[PDB]
Design a binder for these strands. Structure first.
Ligand SMILES: [Mg+2]
Ligand SMILES: [Mg+2]
Ligand SMILES: [Mg+2]
Ligand SMILES: [Mg+2]
Ligand SMILES: [Mg+2]
Ligand SMILES: [Mg+2]
Ligand SMILES: [Mg+2]
Ligand SMILES: [Mg+2]
Ligand SMILES: [Mg+2]
Ligand SMILES: [Mg+2]
Ligand SMILES: [Mg+2]
Ligand SMILES: [Mg+2]
Ligand SMILES: [Mg+2]
Ligand SMILES: [Mg+2]
Ligand SMILES: [Mg+2]
Ligand SMILES: [Mg+2]
Ligand SMILES: [Mg+2]
Ligand SMILES: [Mg+2]
Ligand SMILES: [Mg+2]
Ligand SMILES: [Mg+2]
Ligand SMILES: [Mg+2]
Ligand SMILES: [Mg+2]
Ligand SMILES: [Mg+2]
Ligand SMILES: [Mg+2]
Ligand SMILES: [Mg+2]
Ligand SMILES: [Mg+2]
Ligand SMILES: [Mg+2]
Ligand SMILES: [Mg+2]
Ligand SMILES: [Mg+2]
Lengths: 51, 124, 187, 147, 134, 51, 51, 104
RNA sequence: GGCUAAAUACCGGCACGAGACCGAUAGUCAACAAGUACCGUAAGGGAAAGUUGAAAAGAACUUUGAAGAGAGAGUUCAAG
RNA sequence: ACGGACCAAGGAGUCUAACACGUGCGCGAGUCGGGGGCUACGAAAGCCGCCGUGGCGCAAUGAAGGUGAAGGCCGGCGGCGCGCCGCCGGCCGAGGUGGGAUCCCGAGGCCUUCCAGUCCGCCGAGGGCGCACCACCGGCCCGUCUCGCCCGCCGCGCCGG
RNA sequence: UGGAAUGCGAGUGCCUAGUGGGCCACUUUUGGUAAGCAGAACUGGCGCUGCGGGAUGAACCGAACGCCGGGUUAAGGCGCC
RNA sequence: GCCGUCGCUGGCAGUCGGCAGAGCGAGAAAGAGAGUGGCGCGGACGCUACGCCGCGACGAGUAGGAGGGCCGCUGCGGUG
């Protein structure tokens, strides 16, 4: 499978010029992203009262 | 990842069932059986299931261990609780709280382990 | 009854992206959260651009990103784009750049990494600087598409340098009457 | 996909999207480009100006390969050779000048639009432009001709 | 699956080659299994049914352990008439009820000088297939 | 109905390869296989390789 | 992500052998169900016969 | 076959359905139409405006240094007026504390 | 003045295989004794028409009536 | 004013080519094997790069012969009479003005007994770099006109610039 | 001290069906003795539009429409229908 | 009162629980900030975020346009 498609740094060997498609986002765990102190600190307090 | 394969499973699953303006789900370890990210029993890294015991009495609890994630055979652990209606509903509660294991599912697990006891008492 | 007119009641902005891919529909979830839960009008612009069609977010060239990041003052900032970062083969020197875009062509990843710059993603950016402090929003040329050359005043009209739709261009393709001051007239 | 088309919402409306007063007749303007001079003159003048008439000389037996001349600009001239030739000429110190053969890449004429990097070159090409040659002298370099 | 590009997997073409089959082909079509007492003797699973064979019905209303002689092979109807499989018409006269050869097992062949050739043929190609496998 | 209807479609090679890599990256996820319907509750490991 | 595990070849008796293989990089490419579908509903128009 | 010949009846309402809008008033209007000789001398003026730059700074920085010796040479009732001061969230914080302590 | 295979075409002919096609007012006009019956003096025009049941086991026999027709009886899982 | 006794079934914006815009997707100054070749479903799928020929895009303009897309300051030399002209050797370098999302600095300030007192944050007078885009003015390429003065050399000319 | 009042978020770009027989009314108005006639101007309607009134009614008076309960009106009315 | 559209380019990932402390509706740009010196193991619902929730205003329509149909018909690849 690596000689056919191959990692993102080593091209495909059996095909002429093919590298695995790149990723539009790496850490796809937006739960871990969202409850992270980096982002958690930069938020206003939730306005969770119903009027 | 969880949100990825939920954005893949939200509409083109095989357990998804859509009729009569309702949309439930038949996943193995989905409790409340309804199609949602929170209660889906296959997407997350740690799930909880509460099935009826294979014999007449008891309730089996199926936790999904963390270490084995791509090994379906050695992924789930199962514990049969054949006790009274209250000790089992304090054992599931401890299993979830004291372990801090997917804690937003606890009241769902109690309500299900009560539905099983109720569907395993002698009928009238 | 009230005498209002409902001609313009329905605002036509994009409420969400038209694509159905799930690595974009998750970015749009994260940025809609940041947009509503922060008071930074950066996240709101990133979200509003994540909605836009593939013709409203055009590609950027590496050279235009050079000359837009060489402007005095904006050093050690991260160049944010919402479209793609194409290569620009007619530039010889590349500095180190912190960048965050949706796509970077496989011959611009090479140049940027051999230079020594970073190529972040929108999740990496959202973790580095949530409110987007230290950033430089960019967007490629929108009138670059050949389509915008046929738009405007119709051709055959005094001082309307608008391109017509012609099968081919040549000696005998719309060059005779409405163009020659000799044969008829010209505008 | 017919199930996506517009004739699936047009079932039950009498005129099928085409008008009650003015029907959808067959050819109510003539067929094709008819009336280019009579009743479609505002359109053939607002949108296709210069469509009517003659201009210039004819050329009977035109052969499109006597006049073959694909051009390459100076901006992407340095893209014809590899990268370890431009940087090898950067690190070079004996003044040697790399030979960029253009007709070997597939262009005959060299037009000079872009800037050049400060290093000598020897541009072999078939036809040169005045400015393309001045931008090469002003950087130091030779414009070889090849028939 | 079948890979021979010259055989017809179509439905209506087999349902037409069946009904418009010539008689000599309908003879093979109307084959019938051998009983497990002649099977372990001859090494043969089925045989084209002949007229004077003793047979026993296994499927239908007339399925039982009664054995009967095949009275006639009505190859045009794809059926046979056996000795005591019959019925009473309204008036009283009796008619032979036709049985399909596939629902009936043979218990005593009528060995000719030709049914011996067919048996030894099947046995031959069966030991050849057993040596082809083992 | 005529016989010069456009029956066949052509796809970009890099997009057939994107689809192949996306149909292989999705075969190593217990959820995306147990949701297609397969009964793999006892498979010892998903990328099931044999000698 | 970037961490490529080490799958274990399973002997023909079901039990895991000693051989291991590092998960090829194809099993981390982006999952694009829309691309997969668009490619499938175009490539299977090609095996169709005229009528 | 006589048909109605001309009318303007609905026209004054079609005109206003999309409004009648004055043209787009921009600053820096175009210079097309101006007489050739004048616009040729204005182009010769722009072409040489740079010729007096190094003399223009010598005066801009001059009057900007002089800006120093310019500027550094010069350098309804008592009731509802006291209540509108006690009731200030910031300015009245101490007149409010003086009352809170008042009941001890 | 002359000859010359291969690559090329094929809604006729023989023999085949297939189908995201139609399924008896559709699909060939024609699933059937169909270019038949029929019309026209001729050239030509040209249809409608598939389905008992697993098997005819296709209602013996009794009875009214001249008969068609009934009333019983019987066959069938069912004569609904 | 016209069609309509009743009921059943059938019954009308279809497909191909071209074009334009909008939209989704992949790659992106490239892009595409559609033709050809190699390896039951499969007449499918995969592959070819010294199969990318070729199409479209990357340059326009002229009927054509043809031509074909920033410059500035600096000395030094010749010429005209302090500037310019040409000529060699330097360094600087791809316009500007107005509006302009966004981003950057930040005077001052965001309380708990009282002052000094740092780090973290946030608000903010005022000041900036300015995306895209729009208006305007310059600049550059080809055709054309007007007025001019000079430079080039294997062919000095109805030559070239 | 954003240099009158009152009100109101604006600006811009593509692609585009249908239409290109009209008619009526207040007021002005041309031909004609005039016409439910021919022809114009301004505004409002009918056409494309129900509802209450005018007994009835394309155009008149009121008033413009999601489905409902209570209350109050417009224009018209209140011997009986 | 109920249904729907439009607008708020509105709110909700904070379900932050014995590793706990349950708040951001209040007239007034910004921290319930850090440090530096003078027993009983307990707590409803939610969240298919293409989801859920809260506020107001609005609701005619031929020709025509657009959207949404868990409206319907027949076949194809999957899946129940
Ligand atoms: Mg209303
Ligand atoms: Mg309609
Ligand atoms: Mg009609
Ligand atoms: Mg239409
Ligand atoms: Mg028309
Ligand atoms: Mg038409
Ligand atoms: Mg005429
Ligand atoms: Mg086949
Ligand atoms: Mg029929
Ligand atoms: Mg029929
Ligand atoms: Mg039928
Ligand atoms: Mg027929
Ligand atoms: Mg019929
Ligand atoms: Mg008529
Ligand atoms: Mg009639
Ligand atoms: Mg019908
Ligand atoms: Mg068009
Ligand atoms: Mg397009
Ligand atoms: Mg072409
Ligand atoms: Mg008219
Ligand atoms: Mg008309
Ligand atoms: Mg008239
Ligand atoms: Mg009139
Ligand atoms: Mg009407
Ligand atoms: Mg009408
Ligand atoms: Mg109207
Ligand atoms: Mg009305
Ligand atoms: Mg009246
Ligand atoms: Mg409505």
């Amino acid at each position: 499978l690596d000689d056919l498609y191959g990692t993102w740094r080593k091209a495909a060997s059996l095909k002429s010029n093919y590298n695995l498609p790149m990723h539009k986002m790496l850490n796809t765990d937006l739960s871990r992203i969202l409850k992270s102190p980096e982002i958690q600190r930069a938020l206003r307090a939730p306005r969770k009262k119903i009027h | 990842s969880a949100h990825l394969q939920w954005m893949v499973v939200r509409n083109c699953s095989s357990f998804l069932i859509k009729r009569n303006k309702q949309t439930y789900s038949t996943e193995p370890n989905n409790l409340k059986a309804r199609n949602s990210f929170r209660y889906n029993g296959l997407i997350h890294r740690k799930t909880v299931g509460v099935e009826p015991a294979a014999d007449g009495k008891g309730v089996v609890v199926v936790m999904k261990r963390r270490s084995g994630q791509r090994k379906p055979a050695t992924s789930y652990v199962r514990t049969t609780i054949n006790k009274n209606a209250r000790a089992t509903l304090s054992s599931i509660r401890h299993m979830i709280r004291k372990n801090k294991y997917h804690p937003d599912l606890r009241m769902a697990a109690i309500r299900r382990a009560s539905a099983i006891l109720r569907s395993q008492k002698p009928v009238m | 009854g009230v005498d209002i007119r409902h001609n313009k009641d329905r605002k036509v902005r994009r409420k969400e992206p038209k694509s159905q891919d799930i690595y974009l529909r998750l970015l749009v979830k994260l940025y809609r959260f940041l947009a509503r839960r922060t008071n930074s009008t950066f996240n709101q612009v990133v979200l509003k651009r994540l909605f836009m069609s593939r013709t409203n977010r055009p590609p950027l060239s590496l050279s235009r990103m050079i000359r837009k990041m060489k402007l005095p003052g904006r050093e050690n900032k991260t160049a944010v784009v919402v479209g793609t970062v194409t290569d620009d083969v007619r530039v010889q020197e590349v500095p180190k750049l912190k960048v965050c875009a949706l796509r970077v062509t496989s011959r611009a990843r090479s140049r940027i990494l051999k230079a020594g710059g970073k190529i972040l993603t929108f999740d990496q950016l959202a973790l580095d600087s949530p409110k987007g402090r230290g950033t430089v929003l960019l967007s490629g040329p929108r009138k670059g598409r050949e389509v915008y050359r046929h738009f405007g005043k119709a051709p055959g009209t005094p001082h309307s340098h608008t391109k017509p739709y012609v099968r081919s261009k040549g000696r005998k393709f719309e060059r005779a009457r409405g163009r020659r001051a000799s044969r008829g007239y010209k505008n | 996909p017919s199930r996506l088309r517009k004739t699936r919402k047009l079932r039950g409306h009498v005129s099928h999207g085409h008008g009650r007063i003015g029907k959808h007749r067959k050819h109510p303007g003539g067929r094709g480009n008819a009336g280019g001079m009579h009743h479609h003159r505002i359109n053939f003048d607002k949108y296709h100006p210069g469509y009517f008439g003659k201009v210039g000389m004819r050329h009977y037996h035109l052969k499109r390969n006597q006049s073959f001349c694909p051009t390459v600009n100076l901006d992407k001239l340095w893209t014809l050779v590899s990268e370890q030739t431009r940087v090898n000429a950067a690190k070079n110190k004996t003044g040697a000048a790399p030979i960029i053969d253009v007709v070997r890449s597939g262009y005959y004429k060299v037009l000079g639009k872009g800037k050049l990097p400060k290093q000598p070159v020897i541009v072999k090409a078939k036809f040169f432009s005045r400015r393309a040659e001045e931008k090469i002298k002003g950087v130091g370099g030779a414009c070889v001709l090849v028939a | 699956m079948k890979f021979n590009p010259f055989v017809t997997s179509d439905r209506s073409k087999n349902r037409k080659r069946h009904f418009n089959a010539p008689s000599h082909i309908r003879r093979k079509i109307m084959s019938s299994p051998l009983s497990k007492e002649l099977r372990q003797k001859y090494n043969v699973r089925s045989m084209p049914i002949r007229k004077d064979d003793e047979v026993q019905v296994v499927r239908g209303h007339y399925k039982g352990q009664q054995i009967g002689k095949v009275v006639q092979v009505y190859r045009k109807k794809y059926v046979i008439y056996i000795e005591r499989v019959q019925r009473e018409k309204a008036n009283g006269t009796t008619v032979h009820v036709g049985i399909h050869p596939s629902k009936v097992v043979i218990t005593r062949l009528k060995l000719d000088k030709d049914r011996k050739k067919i048996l030894e043929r099947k046995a031959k190609s069966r030991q050849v297939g057993k040596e082809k496998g083992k | 109905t005529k016989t010069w209807r456009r029956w066949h479609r052509r796809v970009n090679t890099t997009q057939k390869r994107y689809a192949i890599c996306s149909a292989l990256a999705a075969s190593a996820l217990p959820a995306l296989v147990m949701s297609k319907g397969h009964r793999i509750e006892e498979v010892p490991e998903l990328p099931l390789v044999v000698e | 992500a970037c961490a490529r595990p080490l799958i274990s070849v399973y002997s023909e008796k079901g039990e895991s052998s000693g051989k291991n293989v590092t998960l090829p990089a194809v099993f981390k490419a982006p999952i694009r169900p829309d691309i997969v579908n668009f490619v499938h509903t175009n490539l299977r128009k090609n095996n169709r016969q005229p009528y | 076959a006589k048909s109605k010949n001309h009318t303007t009846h609905n026209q004054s309402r079609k005109w206003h359905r999309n409004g009648i809008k004055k043209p787009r008033s921009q600053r820096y209007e175009s210079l097309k139409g101006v007489d050739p000789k004048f616009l040729r001398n204005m182009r010769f003026a722009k072409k040489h405006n740079k010729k007096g730059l190094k003399k223009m700074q010598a005066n801009n920085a001059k009057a900007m240094a002089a800006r120093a010796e310019a500027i550094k040479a010069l350098v309804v009732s008592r009731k509802l007026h006291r209540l509108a001061y006690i009731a200030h969230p910031k300015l009245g914080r101490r007149a409010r504390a003086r009352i809170a302590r008042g009941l001890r």
